């Protein structure tokens, strides 16, 4: 439980950099833009998670459908085992049933 | 986001400060102190 004996260098965070000042600027593009682009067309990230939400099982299934043929051999096997275990756990295990 | 307890030093000090006058290993070891402190109260 020994704690550090020297004060760390305090992080001087600037609240007014380019990222924080312009954070969430075009969130209302659809409302104030004649409904030409839904706000879900601004999300940056995985191909299969742009404007989508789900639990762990529906996420792994969705990943296998879209980018499954582009994955590596080892990653393709690990995903299959994760799908099978979640399928068995969610349906054949639990308390409320 | 890996969350770890950092104030664990004060977690055990709140218990050992009531067990400073005990005899044996109860005044040093935390596992033996809590059972002694709880019975003390």
């Amino acid at each position: 439980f020994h704690v550090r004996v020297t004060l760390p260098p305090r992080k001087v965070v600037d609240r007014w950099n380019e990222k924080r000042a312009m954070f969430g600027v075009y969130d209302n593009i659809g409302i104030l833009g004649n409904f030409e682009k839904h706000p879900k067309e601004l999300i940056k990230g995985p191909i299969w998670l742009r404007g989508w939400k789900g639990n762990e099982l529906q996420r792994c299934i969705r990943k296998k459908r879209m980018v499954g043929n582009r994955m590596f051999i080892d990653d393709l096997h690990n995903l299959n085992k994760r799908i099978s275990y979640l399928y068995k756990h969610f349906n054949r295990h639990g308390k409320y049933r | 986001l890996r969350s770890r307890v950092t104030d664990r030093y004060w977690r055990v000090q709140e218990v050992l400060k009531h067990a400073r006058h005990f005899r044996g290993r109860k005044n040093r070891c935390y596992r033996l102190a809590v059972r002694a402190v709880t019975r003390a109260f």
Binding site: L7, P8 | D7, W10
Partner: peptide, 26 residues
């Protein structure tokens, strides 16, 4: 190295207490 500052600073309150006990001020 655990992230944070409360743990680091709170111990500095303890280090001052030990120094006073070892070397009491006039």
């Amino acid at each position: 190295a655990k992230k944070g500052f409360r743990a680091a600073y709170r111990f500095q309150k303890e280090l001052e207490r030990w120094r006073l006990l070892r070397c009491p001020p006039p």
